Design brief:
Main location (chain A): cytoplasm
GO cellular component, one term (chain A): non-motile cilium
Protein name (chain A): Intraflagellar transport protein 121
Distance between the termini of chain B: 86 Å
Oligomer: part of a larger assembly
Shape of chain A: extended
Number of helices of chain A: 23
Subcellular location (chain A): Cytoplasm, Cytoskeleton, Cilium basal body
Distance between the termini of chain A: 109 Å
Keywords (chain A): Cell projection, Cilium, Cilium biogenesis/degradation, Cytoplasm, Cytoskeleton, Flagellum, Repeat, WD repeat
Largest sheet of chain B: 4 strands, antiparallel
Strand content of chain B: 35-45%
Shape of chain B: elongated
Number of strands of chain B: 49
Chain lengths: ~1000, ~675
């Protein structure tokens, strides 16, 4: 979050601009000059993706490509409004001449002429799209004009009207009196309600409304239900509204004398502009300045403009730029918008918002292989990522309580504390997470300095959450004895000053507070090492590799250092450390070097300076929020472009900047063999460059330059490779073996089928990937056939482990695995293939008894029995035979393999079939002989029995029809 | 469904009037149900029913009442040519005498501009006036209603035409309802353009501004005295000479019997933005009804078949979440999902919906099979080929066609059931009884096999890959794992509102609920996670969690159990769960725990899947060393001696190896500190 005066465009005729507004559609911003001037400046949409192509001396912005003077009005153009859909540039003077400007053949020319002209059209606006226009004259004449600006209804409200503004829904307009009140009236003219005056609250007197600006919702809000309406006053207290009847209107004690206010086109940043009677000077210099607040209204930034007068401000569509109605020029100022982000382990975290969801999409996207992770985590405040873990400043399921969600490189939660400490000033290490309240600093030591290393005894670490402490920004030693985390929450009096920002490393803490008095804490003793005092109120703090020079960038965004070695000049120990004499103009963030203590990859305005000391290296411009400065080399994250690609991020934004130290050093390493190379490695240190020279001369086969470059630094395998390629046979084989050593399967394959070894690039393609084409590589040439048949089985069982049993099945056709094919067709309900796999598996093995037990587990009657008998599982065959009511066959096979449970189970399940309303089954299961003549005889005898009974006639007639039809067939075969 | 009686009360009688709930109007929140019963404004509460105010302001019986649409007053129109207006405090403020007996009432949403249709005029009552701003229409104004914006007042006239007028009474529309005049119109307080032109002939006319219908003009089976839109126009409460109230989808298709009353529901009105309805009868009996809509659903772990629009089912295939409903156009009773089949219990019959695509990613179902007879069941079971009816004791076997092949009258009350997974005509009914005994019945097995007598009643069970591990969640919300190989309680844990096993891993059971997602991953100890709801599916690492109205997809990592696997030198089992799919850091852990411990056979496979060929070379060198003696301190020394740290490589070269290597190698590595 920073703003700087980027570029001023030389405006023709040097006209004071009465109000400005950016063309949100095409960027053809028409500054509204006085005396009828509507000069259409042209800047295209410039983002950090321009800085992707503008490295080493760039900035997001354009130039004076076109500035067309428009001839439509005569008075000062106090009303300039932009149609956000039709590009109907429409303006009016202080007299009431309304003209819609078409982009006629590239120029802005007149289309519509609306005229009432009885008093002053003082404010006038288009809707969210630009379908209705609020032509309001000074006598309260509300001409709500349509898209063609005709007088749909002109109603005078009987009072003077000066400021009007379209609501996002655009029905209840904001008829604001110049005296200090804002009224709401509908199209019928009936009185509805009145806008609250929290701007007038806290300040005695109805102060004049300077401008009523509502973010109409051109690109949606930053977060939903955020205040985007600002009825500001000249008093210095102004209110931020979600809607025109907001009772939670944030009365910000701005304490200034503004004239204008404009929200950005994405609803993230409030901007209030105007002059000031300067209390610093006696004359009261008319210093026109632009304040900056959030949608809620916390103090964000401040713009310093020495211009004669800024009677209007306007933002870009995404809020990356702010145009100004300066009296001299149109001041274009680049803005870094507010994002919750983090970088750790080549994973760029960023809490953007999709335009279909309100939850903070904590995009834990990896930048190592472009691995995407849209973690949707509720109630997120901020993101801090450092080391192997990233922590998300999230509340609980309720506000007040908070969760320190420890996330790994993919972003999954592995550790979390339900804490009352809100992690506003959040720092994460590899062993601690430093949540911090206004005074309550909570190091969450999730792991000690001796933890997950040995764990040789069950009492390895006996205190999981007592190592953590919710200590103070003013505590001096919470390790005189052993202390609980909840030891501190308050003093006997107030704290001296709240915290500003907190950064830390694995065994250090540095608590940057607003007054600068830093209480620096150790780990895990969590003792005060050194009570530092910063000479400026920091907006961010960044520590060095050695932490000697650390950076303090203040609320005005000026880089000041801090050498941590100084003594308190007050008779005590209140002050440690001192500002190293290094200050740069409008420097807003830092990426300290992880190699050289004197180096740092600082943010200036857009240019990214490097200093090997306090003297400049190459100003390698990086508007990208950097990731790491190490080994004279700089890593970047083009987050603004990854705001534009947040669901589809890519490694293209993760560019690798460099210092001219590394650049010229490794440049002469790769160009000059040893000539400039050898000594210049030691000239620009960190013998990573000795490896650059050493494996460079190893690759170029300079077995003396590589040899002696491996002499000056630490590498055994490299010098072994020097002796290898010094004795390896073929140069094509030299590079191919190097490539297969160095993972370059492409370059190894590039030198296979070239020195005539098709099977070895068959091995390179044979390794990794789908195993179908690898099966063809197995069969076309016996390369790594066994290992990759094993791999066929491996992704076969992985597909089997992931309900892809069919692709697994042709893998085990490609490989050989038949019981796992049984499992493939077992969960797919294809037990016929299991009976097929009786014989694909080695028969006679109890694997067939296992699959027969599977058939029993589904209840298959006798195919499980023959799966048993193929395995010789005759007892289970008999158990399934007598189990499932095939009593004639149960008798036969249970006397075959000799386990006669036939009659007990026979009578039991006869009674059960009687319980299952099947009486006839219970009778006919006693037919162990069961001839057709015997069946008819049994049915007829039972018919005679129940006929003599005559009771239950259903059985009587059933036995009649069965026996009589069978006897009828007997007579048909007889006579 | 269920339509619970919220309350039901016979109104008190006073002033000797016919106890009829003539009209029903609601406070816009729905708290006070304002019933004009007899000559009283019997003001009740639509959650309890207690008579908050008996307002006896009229002379004759109050023909009609209407609350203020902005929520300030409720008036009362009777046959005594007057209207007495009561504020929201139920106090009579205004009593203005018309020129004819009042026919109906309606209030403005913008102001308290009551309209009071008389037999010849409409008594527009401004929020504080005593005048009768009459609407002299040649036809009798039989119905009035104010549009929800607060501009239009549809004066339905006694000519078969709803003459929509303004707040001054100017005829604008000639709505062609037909020959029948429409005494019952009502602008929905959320719909300014949907006019419910309910008549006596039975036609359900949902008319627009000019006189065209919205849905099909349904001819009711009964003459409706009042028709109103439930749930802001999705459902319909019809009430007439049927003595009760029915629920209909806004198509006009039957849902359920809302009310169960004594006489003519003269006025029906849903409680606004509630589940309740104003059912006031000819006996005056006013009654709210809990029209609670449960997402009745089957699930084959991927196609969440929650019923929505209540004649259709919006099945969301949770892998794709394709929410394209099945246009059954008839009330859905019970639903079940198979691999590709969807048995649906309608008021028609069993409708087994089968997807046209052989996959599950597409949605647009078609009814491949239907049980021909109308057939319904409590727990619907669709197999590959059977629609098995689960009753509390009986188990009526049916196919997809409706053949009662078997019936299984079980011993106890069935509280849970599922399909064990099997071939066509062989799928199971793994019964979770209220007694707690688990019985195994398949399609063609006539007898149950009692697997587990679970300790408590069974509401959530599951079976493993081999159908042999029965984790049972009781009504006490804890998982009781019954390995059917052991046939006993082999594992039991709390924090389990429901448990689901895996289709490829044996002891892979997760269980969410009670805000805790504890996952005993395999033999190795528990994995920690937080989740509420009911797990009805566990595909190794994923949960389709029933959060009481819908499925919520929350993953289960095995990372804690992964660390347990790796750090116990079980990187074979960790390799297996890596084949199940975990992070490559666990793969490197397999390769390194095999590297440094000189288990250099697993190290080759775990390194080669990351394609780390140099580590494969180190592993191969020291593995060829370990396959040929040459005591492994020399070979571990070689492990660090080709890696880069030579204090331990040399200190293990103290007794097995050479440290003069360090003298002649620290020189050409400028590591002269350890050279010294």
């Amino acid at each position: 979050m920073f703003i700087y005066l980027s570029k001023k465009i030389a405006i023709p005729n040097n006209v004071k601009l009465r109000c400005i507004s950016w063309n949100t559609d095409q960027g053809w911003i028409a500054c509204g000059g006085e005396s009828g001037l509507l000069k259409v400046l042209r800047l295209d949409g410039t983002t950090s993706k321009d800085v992707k192509g503008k490295k080493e001396g760039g900035a997001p912005g354009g130039n004076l490509s076109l500035n067309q003077t428009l001839e439509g009005h005569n008075g000062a153009v106090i009303c300039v409004c932009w149609n956000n859909a039709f590009q109907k540039l429409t303006t009016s003077d202080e007299f009431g001449l309304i003209i819609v400007w078409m982009l006629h053949k590239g120029m802005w020319f007149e289309e519509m002429i609306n005229n009432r002209n009885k008093s002053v059209v003082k404010d006038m606006k288009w809707t969210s799209n630009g379908e209705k226009i609020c032509i309001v004259y000074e006598d309260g004449a509300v001409i709500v004009g349509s898209v063609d600006g005709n007088r749909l209804w002109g109603k005078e409200l009987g009072m003077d009207l000066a400021l009007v503004e379209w609501s996002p829904d655009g029905r209840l307009l904001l008829f604001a009196t110049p005296g200090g009140e804002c009224h709401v009236y509908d199209g019928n003219g009936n009185g509805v309600a009145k806008v609250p005056l929290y701007c007038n609250e806290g300040y005695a007197g109805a102060s004049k409304i300077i401008g009523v600006e509502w973010y109409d919702g051109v690109e949606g809000y930053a977060e939903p239900n955020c205040p985007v309406l600002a009825i500001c006053l000249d008093n210095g207290r102004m209110q931020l509204m979600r809607y025109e009847s907001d009772d939670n209107a944030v009365c910000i004690d701005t304490g200034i004398k503004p004239v204008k206010v404009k929200w950005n086109m994405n609803g993230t940043i409030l901007a209030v502009a105007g002059f000031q009677m300067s209390s610093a000077v006696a004359d009261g210099r008319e210093l026109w300045m632009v304040q900056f607040y959030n949608h809620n209204g916390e103090h964000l930034r401040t713009l310093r403009v020495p211009g004669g007068g800024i009677s209007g401000i306007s933002w870009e569509g995404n809020g990356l730029r702010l145009a100004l109605s300066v009296d001299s020029y149109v001041y274009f100022a680049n803005v870094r918008p507010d994002y919750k982000w983090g970088y750790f382990c080549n994973t760029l975290v960023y809490a953007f918002n999709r335009p279909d969801r309100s939850e903070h999409c904590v995009m834990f996207w990896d930048t190592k292989n472009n691995d995407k992770y849209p973690k949707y985590v509720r109630k997120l405040v901020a993101i801090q990522a450092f080391g192997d873990f990233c922590v998300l400043a999230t509340k609980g399921e309720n506000p007040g309580e908070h969760i320190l969600i420890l996330c790994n490189a993919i972003g999954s939660p592995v550790d979390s504390k339900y804490i009352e400490v809100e992690p506003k000033y959040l720092a994460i290490t590899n062993y601690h997470v430093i949540a911090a309240n206004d005074e309550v600093v909570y190091v969450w030591q999730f792991r000690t300095s001796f933890s997950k290393v040995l764990s040789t005894d069950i009492n390895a670490v006996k205190r999981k959450d007592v190592r953590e402490k919710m200590f103070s920004v003013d505590d001096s030693n919470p390790a005189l004895s052993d202390r609980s985390p909840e030891s501190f929450r308050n003093m006997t009096t107030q704290t001296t000053d709240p915290i500003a920002c907190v950064t830390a490393c694995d065994s250090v803490l540095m608590i940057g507070r607003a007054s600068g008095v830093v209480n620096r804490y150790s780990l895990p003793h969590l003792t005060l090492d050194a009570q530092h005092v910063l000479r400026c109120r920091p907006q961010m703090l960044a520590l060095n590799c050695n932490l000697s020079k650390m950076s303090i960038i203040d609320i005005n965004g000026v880089l000041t250092f801090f050498d941590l070695t100084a003594k308190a000049p007050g008779g005590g120990a209140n002050t440690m450390g001192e500002h190293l004499s290094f200050e740069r103009k409008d420097a807003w963030d830092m990426r300290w070097a992880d190699d050289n203590p004197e180096l740092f990859a600082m943010m200036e305005k857009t240019r990214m300076y490097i200093f090997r000391g306090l003297d400049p290296e190459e100003p390698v411009t990086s508007s990208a929020y950097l990731c790491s400065f190490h080994d004279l080399e700089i890593t970047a994250a083009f987050l603004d472009d990854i705001m534009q690609q947040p669901d589809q991020p890519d490694l293209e934004f993760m560019v690798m900047y460099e210092t001219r130290s590394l650049r010229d050093t490794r440049e002469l390493l790769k160009s000059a063999s040893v000539d400039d190379a050898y000594a210049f490695v030691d000239s620009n240190s960190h013998p990573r460059l000795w490896r650059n020279l050493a494996e460079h001369a190893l690759e170029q086969l300079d077995f003396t330059t590589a040899d002696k470059a491996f002499v000056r630094c630490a590498d055994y395998q490299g010098i072994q490779f020097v002796k290898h390629l010094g004795k390896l046979d073929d140069k094509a084989k030299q590079r191919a073996e190097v490539a297969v050593y160095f993972k370059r399967f492409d370059e190894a394959e590039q030198l296979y089928m070239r020195m005539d070894r098709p099977d070895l690039a068959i091995d390179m393609r044979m390794r990794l990937g789908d195993w179908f084409k690898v099966e063809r590589l197995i069969r076309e040439s016996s390369g790594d056939d066994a290992q990759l048949l094993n791999a066929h089985n491996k992704i076969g069982q992985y597909y089997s482990d992931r309900h892809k049993w069919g692709k697994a099945a042709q893998y085990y056709a490609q490989a050989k695995n038949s019981e796992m094919l049984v499992e493939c067709f077992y969960a797919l309900e294809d037990f016929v293939a299991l009976g097929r796999l009786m014989d694909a598996l080695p028969d006679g093995s109890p694997l067939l008894a296992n699959i027969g037990e599977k058939f029993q587990s589904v209840g298959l009657c006798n195919e499980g029995v023959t799966a048993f008998l193929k395995a010789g599982d005759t007892k289970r065959a008999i158990d399934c035979c007598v189990l499932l009511n095939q009593w004639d066959q149960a008798v036969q096979l249970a006397q075959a393999h000799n386990f006669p449970q036939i009659e007990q189970l026979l009578a039991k399940y006869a009674n059960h079939l009687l319980e299952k309303e099947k009486v006839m089954d219970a009778i006919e299961l006693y037919r162990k002989a069961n001839h057709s003549m015997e069946a008819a005889r049994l049915l007829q005898d039972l018919a005679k029995k129940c006929a003599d009974q005559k009771v239950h006639p259903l059985r009587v007639k059933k036995l009649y029809v069965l026996a009589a039809l069978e006897i009828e067939k007997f007579k048909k075969r007889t006579l | 469904m269920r339509t619970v009686v919220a309350w039901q009360e016979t109104p008190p009688e006073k002033d000797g009037v016919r106890n009829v709930c003539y009209d029903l109007c609601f406070k816009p929140d729905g708290s006070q149900v304002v019933a004009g019963i007899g000559n009283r404004v019997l003001v009740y509460d639509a959650a309890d029913g207690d008579l908050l105010h008996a307002l006896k302001g009229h002379k004759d019986s109050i023909y009609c009442v209407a609350y203020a649409q902005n929520g300030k007053r409720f008036a009362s129109g009777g046959a005594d040519k007057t209207v007495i207006i009561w504020t929201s405090k139920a106090e009579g403020i205004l009593k203005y005498t018309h020129n004819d007996a009042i026919q109906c009432l309606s209030y403005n949403p913008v102001t308290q501009q009551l309209a009071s249709a008389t037999g010849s005029d409409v008594g527009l009552w401004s929020p504080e006036q005593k005048s009768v701003a009459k609407h002299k229409v040649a036809s009798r104004i039989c119905s009035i209603s104010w549009t929800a914006d607060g501009a239009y007042l549809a004066l339905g006239c006694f000519d078969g035409v709803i003459s929509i007028r303004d707040k001054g009474g100017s005829e604008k529309h000639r709505i062609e309802t037909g020959p029948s005049p429409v005494w019952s119109i009502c602008w929905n307080p959320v719909e300014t353009n949907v006019l419910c032109a309910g008549c006596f002939d039975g036609v359900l006319k949902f008319y627009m501004m000019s006189g065209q219908q919205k849905s099909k003009d349904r001819e009711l089976a009964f003459d409706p005295l009042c028709v109103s839109y439930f749930s802001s126009g999705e459902y319909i409460t019809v009430s007439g000479t049927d003595k009760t109230v029915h629920l209909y989808t806004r198509d006009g298709t039957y849902l359920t019997k809302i009310a169960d009353r004594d006489s003519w529901v003269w006025a029906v009105r849903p409680r606004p933005k509630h589940n309740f309805v104003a059912v006031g009868t000819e006996g005056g009996g006013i009654a709210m009804f809990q029209l609670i809509f449960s997402t009745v659903h089957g699930l084959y772990q991927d196609r969440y078949a929650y019923r929505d629009q209540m004649t259709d089912v919006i099945i969301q295939h949770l892998i794709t979440e394709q929410k394209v409903r099945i246009k059954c156009k008839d009330y859905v009773k019970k639903i079940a999902v198979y691999k590709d089949k969807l048995a649906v219990q309608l008021q028609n019959k069993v409708v087994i919906y089968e997807l046209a695509n052989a996959d599950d990613f597409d949605m647009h179902y078609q009814s491949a099979t239907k049980i021909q007879q109308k057939l319904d069941c409590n727990l619907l079971v669709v197999t590959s080929h059977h629609v098995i009816l689960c009753q509390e004791k009986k188990l009526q076997l049916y196919n997809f066609d409706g053949v009662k092949e078997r019936e299984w009258v079980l011993d106890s009350v069935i509280r849970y059931i599922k399909v064990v997974g099997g071939p066509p005509r062989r799928e199971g009914l793994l019964v979770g009884l209220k007694s707690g005994a688990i019985l195994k019945i398949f399609v063609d097995n006539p007898f149950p096999i009692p697997l587990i007598k679970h300790t408590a009643s069974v509401r959530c069970l599951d079976l493993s890959a081999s159908r042999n591990k029965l984790a049972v969640v009781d009504e006490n919300a804890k998982v009781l794992v019954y390995n059917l190989i052991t046939k006993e309680l082999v594992f039991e844990e709390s924090n389990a509102n429901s448990v689901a096993w895996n289709s490829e891993f044996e002891d892979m059971f997760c269980y969410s609920g009670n805000g805790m997602l504890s996952i005993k991953t395999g033999d190795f100890p528990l994995h920690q996670q937080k989740l509420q709801g009911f797990v009805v599916g566990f595909k190794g690492s994923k949960i389709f969690c029933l959060h009481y109205v819908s499925m919520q997809t929350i993953d289960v990592p095995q990372s804690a159990s992964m660390y347990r696997y790796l750090e116990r030198k079980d990187f074979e089992s960790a390799y297996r769960v890596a084949c199940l799919g975990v992070t490559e850091a666990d793969w490197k852990q397999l390769a390194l725990e095999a590297l440094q411990a000189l288990n250099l056979e697993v190290a080759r496979k775990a390194f080669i899947r990351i394609r780390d060929v140099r580590f494969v070379e180190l592993v191969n060198r020291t593995e060829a060393g370990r396959k040929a003696g040459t005591s492994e301190q020399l070979l571990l020394a070689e492990i660090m001696a080709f890696q880069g740290r030579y204090q331990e490589a040399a200190r293990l070269f103290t007794q097995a190896g050479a440290v003069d290597r360090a003298m002649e190698m620290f020189s050409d590595l400028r590591q002269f500190d350890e050279a010294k």
